[PDB]
Write a protein that binds this ligand. Structure first.
Ligand SMILES: O[C@H]1[C@H](O)[C@@H](O)[C@H](O)[C@@H](O)[C@H]1O
Ligand SMILES: O[C@H]1[C@H](O)[C@@H](O)[C@H](O)[C@@H](O)[C@H]1O
Ligand SMILES: N[C@@H](CC(=O)O)C(=O)O
Ligand SMILES: N[C@@H](CC(=O)O)C(=O)O
Ligand SMILES: N[C@@H](CC(=O)O)C(=O)O
Ligand SMILES: N[C@@H](CC(=O)O)C(=O)O
Ligand SMILES: N[C@@H](CC(=O)O)C(=O)O
Ligand SMILES: N[C@@H](CC(=O)O)C(=O)O
Ligand SMILES: [Mg+2]
Ligand SMILES: [Mg+2]
Lengths: 252, 252
């Protein structure tokens, strides 16, 4: 499998997940249907999205790490799948939620070769590969802001901060893409509980880095050894390389 | 003018503003074209939205209080207009932004008779009149959550908080409607600067109250005497009546 295969696979999944969600009334979407392998409820919207995606991934030689069904398959290519990132928004009709996929040549983030996040409500397509990062077929890059007085996505502000704007949209994969395309100047997840899982973050991280972003853990450490499994957790500090160290100092 | 006139006028404005914005590429939307009477820049998207709305309101006997052009006309019915609430989102292609209208029989919020907020990206229509509050033609009401451990929209969290979720979407009028329809359990704007203007909040406040919500200033004081002018500022605490007093105690 190469990056072209991954793009093709991702686009087919996006199409099937989009069709499955769009036809589901909010009343149905919001229903709990079971307990996910991640230890949070699987909503009916989560279930239909994952089935749509797994139906396609099942044909490939991959090991899938996915929120609801856990680790599936035995292939050498690892796929971190979030079949519906932003479930709360989807069940409320708030148009920020997406399907997220990151493909790696091992079970570690450093061997990632493809990232894909598709907004299921708007049809916006973000992806990145060896040639760079894209939004709807157009090359993107992070902003060049150097000041802390900037436009920040942050989970969660717990003190007075110097930002120009703070936003929290409820879809980490999509929000990492808002940072990747320069819509926002930085993305932070500094929750002490360390809540982000590998499938929430992996594609967004890969896309943001291809777009020029510097993206690390809380203390500046590389995310390269983050594992494609259900147990992995992440804090994220993401910004261009001039802003990034200021962000690190800010949160000490 | 009564509440049926106001509904008809609002729908006409929504249609015109919607097509004016939808046709404008992001790179055009984001351009500063002048200084607004509110003291913030008018973007091309703001100007185009406002001209569309004013062309319609010009035929009515109203005094309009609007963000970019200020106070216009001499009619006895006052209209607080935010031609595009969530301009930052609109210029970035983030689908949470709306046109907001509150109609009052004086220059005070207590004399409001109609509120209308239309999401320009999704086409969701929120309004309220003597018969109640509506989302896309269906009656809505606030949630009945009684615990602080709830789903909150809050500008801005500056300390550790007990919420289940915190969200900040960048469109106060629309966010007040997310609260009105029960999608979120409360809306708070507790920014010490007191940043909200009458046209940001008036329609959202009126819709939320019609939906059963209790909505007050920071100290629990009524919003009735808030004025339809450019100088007015608001902090907001909005929740059902069981949750509301707990929030008041929380933010001391
Ligand atoms: O998939 C979700 C989503 O990314 C949310 O925005 C984030 O707060 C949660 O931690 C994550 O599980
Ligand atoms: O119209 C805007 C919008 O409602 C934003 O969400 C809010 O943060 C701003 O204060 C307001 O001016
Ligand atoms: N992924 C899209 C196609 C595309 O973005 O080109 C879809 O299948 O709906
Ligand atoms: N969240 C979606 C609702 C849907 O498509 O069912 C939207 O308003 O864009
Ligand atoms: N304002 C809408 C109509 C409606 O809200 O029902 C439009 O003309 O696009
Ligand atoms: N507020 C300005 C500058 C910025 O926030 O980047 C804008 O909307 O473009
Ligand atoms: N501002 C975007 C919102 C969206 O992608 O739906 C637009 O042009 O419609
Ligand atoms: N999924 C949410 C539902 C809600 O907060 O209303 C929960 O854990 O309760
Ligand atoms: Mg998910
Ligand atoms: Mg505005």
């Amino acid at each position: 499998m190469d990056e072209r295969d991954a793009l093709r696979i991702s686009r087919e999944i996006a199409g099937e997940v989009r069709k499955a969600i769009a036809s589901m009334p909010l009343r149905e979407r919001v229903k709990d249907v079971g307990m996910g392998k991640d230890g949070t409820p699987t909503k009916a919207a989560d279930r239909v999205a994952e089935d749509a995606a797994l139906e396609i991934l099942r044909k490939e030689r991959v090991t899938v790490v996915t929120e609801e069904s856990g680790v599936l398959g035995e292939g050498d290519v690892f796929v971190a799948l979030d079949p519906l990132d932003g479930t709360f928004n989807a069940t409320r009709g708030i148009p920020v939620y997406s399907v997220s996929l990151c493909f790696s040549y091992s079970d570690k983030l450093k061997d990632a070769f493809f990232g894909y996040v598709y907004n299921l409500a708007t049809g916006d397509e973000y992806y990145a590969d060896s040639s760079g990062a894209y939004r709807n077929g157009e090359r993107i890059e992070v902003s060049d802001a150097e000041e802390l007085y900037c436009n920040a996505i942050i989970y969660y502000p717990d003190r007075k901060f110097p930002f120009k704007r703070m936003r929290i949209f409820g879809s980490a994969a999509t929000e990492l893409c808002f940072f990747a395309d320069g819509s926002f100047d930085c993305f932070l997840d500094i929750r002490p509980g360390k809540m982000l899982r590998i499938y929430d973050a992996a594609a967004g991280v890969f896309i943001a880095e291809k777009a020029g972003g510097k993206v690390t853990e809380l203390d500046g450490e590389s995310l390269g050894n983050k594992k494609f499994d259900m147990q992995e957790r992440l804090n994220i500090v993401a910004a261009n390389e001039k802003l990034h160290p200021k962000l690190l100092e800010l949160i000490k």
